[PDB]
Design an enzyme around this catalytic site. Structure first.
Site, PDB file in Angstrom:
ATOM      1  N   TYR A  19     -65.113 -41.318 -12.462  1.00 44.94           N
ATOM      2  CA  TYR A  19     -65.070 -40.083 -12.174  1.00 44.94           C
ATOM      3  C   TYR A  19     -65.247 -39.095 -11.640  1.00 44.94           C
ATOM      4  O   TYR A  19     -64.759 -38.173 -12.105  1.00 44.94           O
ATOM      5  CB  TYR A  19     -65.014 -39.753 -14.312  1.00 44.94           C
ATOM      6  CG  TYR A  19     -64.090 -40.503 -15.186  1.00 44.94           C
ATOM      7  CD1 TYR A  19     -63.017 -40.245 -15.741  1.00 44.94           C
ATOM      8  CD2 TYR A  19     -64.624 -41.875 -15.111  1.00 44.94           C
ATOM      9  CE1 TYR A  19     -62.069 -41.502 -15.681  1.00 44.94           C
ATOM     10  CE2 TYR A  19     -63.882 -43.016 -15.659  1.00 44.94           C
ATOM     11  CZ  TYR A  19     -62.375 -42.514 -16.419  1.00 44.94           C
ATOM     12  OH  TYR A  19     -62.184 -43.092 -17.163  1.00 44.94           O
ATOM     13  N   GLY A  51     -65.332 -36.288  -9.674  1.00 46.44           N
ATOM     14  CA  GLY A  51     -64.401 -35.774  -7.668  1.00 46.44           C
ATOM     15  C   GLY A  51     -63.649 -35.676  -8.740  1.00 46.44           C
ATOM     16  O   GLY A  51     -63.113 -35.643 -10.186  1.00 46.44           O
ATOM     17  N   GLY A  93     -59.510 -36.622  -9.949  1.00 42.47           N
ATOM     18  CA  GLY A  93     -58.638 -37.329 -10.906  1.00 42.47           C
ATOM     19  C   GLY A  93     -60.156 -38.691 -11.265  1.00 42.47           C
ATOM     20  O   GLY A  93     -61.165 -37.880 -12.134  1.00 42.47           O
ATOM     21  N   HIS A 144     -65.702 -33.911 -19.282  1.00 45.95           N
ATOM     22  CA  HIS A 144     -65.762 -33.218 -18.287  1.00 45.95           C
ATOM     23  C   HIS A 144     -63.973 -33.010 -17.925  1.00 45.95           C
ATOM     24  O   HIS A 144     -63.176 -32.320 -18.048  1.00 45.95           O
ATOM     25  CB  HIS A 144     -66.116 -32.787 -16.489  1.00 45.95           C
ATOM     26  CG  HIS A 144     -66.177 -31.437 -16.634  1.00 45.95           C
ATOM     27  ND1 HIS A 144     -66.037 -31.045 -15.121  1.00 45.95           N
ATOM     28  CD2 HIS A 144     -66.335 -30.113 -16.429  1.00 45.95           C
ATOM     29  CE1 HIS A 144     -65.310 -30.055 -14.898  1.00 45.95           C
ATOM     30  NE2 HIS A 144     -66.267 -29.020 -15.817  1.00 45.95           N
ATOM     31  N   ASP A 145     -63.337 -35.020 -17.642  1.00 44.67           N
ATOM     32  CA  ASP A 145     -62.438 -34.087 -17.317  1.00 44.67           C
ATOM     33  C   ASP A 145     -60.993 -34.682 -18.427  1.00 44.67           C
ATOM     34  O   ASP A 145     -60.145 -33.827 -18.532  1.00 44.67           O
ATOM     35  CB  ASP A 145     -61.704 -35.850 -16.543  1.00 44.67           C
ATOM     36  CG  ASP A 145     -62.240 -35.979 -14.995  1.00 44.67           C
ATOM     37  OD1 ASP A 145     -62.792 -35.058 -14.757  1.00 44.67           O
ATOM     38  OD2 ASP A 145     -61.907 -36.727 -14.730  1.00 44.67           O
ATOM     39  N   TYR A 178     -60.868 -30.352 -19.574  1.00 39.78           N
ATOM     40  CA  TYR A 178     -59.759 -29.835 -18.770  1.00 39.78           C
ATOM     41  C   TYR A 178     -58.565 -30.729 -19.335  1.00 39.78           C
ATOM     42  O   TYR A 178     -57.636 -29.324 -19.367  1.00 39.78           O
ATOM     43  CB  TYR A 178     -59.895 -29.817 -17.212  1.00 39.78           C
ATOM     44  CG  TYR A 178     -61.043 -29.138 -16.450  1.00 39.78           C
ATOM     45  CD1 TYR A 178     -62.091 -29.150 -17.048  1.00 39.78           C
ATOM     46  CD2 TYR A 178     -61.088 -29.578 -15.131  1.00 39.78           C
ATOM     47  CE1 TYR A 178     -62.771 -27.778 -16.060  1.00 39.78           C
ATOM     48  CE2 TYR A 178     -61.659 -28.374 -14.504  1.00 39.78           C
ATOM     49  CZ  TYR A 178     -62.526 -27.678 -14.635  1.00 39.78           C
ATOM     50  OH  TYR A 178     -63.964 -26.515 -14.539  1.00 39.78           O
ATOM     51  N   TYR A 222     -63.686 -17.505 -14.598  1.00 41.19           N
ATOM     52  CA  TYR A 222     -64.184 -16.693 -15.379  1.00 41.19           C
ATOM     53  C   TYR A 222     -65.804 -16.178 -15.439  1.00 41.19           C
ATOM     54  O   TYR A 222     -65.928 -16.380 -13.964  1.00 41.19           O
ATOM     55  CB  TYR A 222     -64.886 -18.345 -17.132  1.00 41.19           C
ATOM     56  CG  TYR A 222     -65.568 -18.714 -15.865  1.00 41.19           C
ATOM     57  CD1 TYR A 222     -66.816 -19.087 -15.982  1.00 41.19           C
ATOM     58  CD2 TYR A 222     -64.788 -20.899 -15.410  1.00 41.19           C
ATOM     59  CE1 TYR A 222     -67.480 -20.363 -15.144  1.00 41.19           C
ATOM     60  CE2 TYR A 222     -65.719 -21.443 -15.437  1.00 41.19           C
ATOM     61  CZ  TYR A 222     -67.083 -21.457 -15.271  1.00 41.19           C
ATOM     62  OH  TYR A 222     -67.548 -22.721 -14.672  1.00 41.19           O
ATOM     63  N   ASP A 259     -67.398 -26.610 -18.204  1.00 40.64           N
ATOM     64  CA  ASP A 259     -68.797 -26.511 -17.798  1.00 40.64           C
ATOM     65  C   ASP A 259     -70.079 -26.315 -17.853  1.00 40.64           C
ATOM     66  O   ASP A 259     -70.758 -27.350 -16.983  1.00 40.64           O
ATOM     67  CB  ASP A 259     -67.737 -24.919 -16.167  1.00 40.64           C
ATOM     68  CG  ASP A 259     -66.272 -25.548 -15.967  1.00 40.64           C
ATOM     69  OD1 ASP A 259     -66.568 -25.010 -15.127  1.00 40.64           O
ATOM     70  OD2 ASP A 259     -65.782 -26.407 -15.517  1.00 40.64           O
TER      71      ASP A 259
HETATM   72 CA    CA Z   1     -62.652 -36.096 -12.192  1.00 41.46          CA
END
Ligand code: CA
Length: 117
Positions: free
Chosen positions: A28, A30, A32, A48-49, A52, A67, A93
């Site tokens: 995970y 990087g 995709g 985190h993915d 988003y 931001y 983030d």
């Molecule tokens: Ca990712």
């Protein structure tokens, strides 16, 4: 945006160059990501993915980045100046930067072959 995330991570881990250290780690961290996270750090990247992915579904993000935040004494603060979309991404983030600073880093998982994902 990536530039801010890179800075947040350095706020928490001052000895790192995050774009080098954390890019292409596990399944995970990087671009995709799929399969099952290989360790806790990769799990930080999966959350985190998912943060988003959540952001892209909010009405406010529709038109949505860049931001505002501060690092002081190694602590990150998202700014109240951020509009709704920007505030949501600053929080994704910030949580990932903190997550990364709290789990082990396994060199065996850096540049992992995706056949494992
Ligand atoms: Ca990712």
């Amino acid at each position: 945006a990536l530039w801010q995330f890179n800075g947040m991570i350095k706020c928490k881990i001052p000895s790192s160059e995050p774009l080098l250290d954390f890019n292409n780690y596990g399944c995970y961290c990087g671009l995709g990501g799929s399969g099952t996270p290989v360790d806790d750090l990769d799990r930080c990247c999966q959350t985190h993915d998912n943060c988003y992915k959540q952001a892209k579904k909010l009405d406010s993000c529709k038109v949505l980045n860049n931001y505002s935040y501060s690092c002081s004494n190694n602590e990150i603060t998202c700014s109240s100046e951020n509009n709704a979309c920007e505030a949501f991404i600053c929080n994704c983030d910030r949580n990932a930067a903190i997550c990364f600073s709290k789990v082990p880093y396994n060199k065996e998982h850096k540049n992992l072959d995706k056949k494992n994902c």
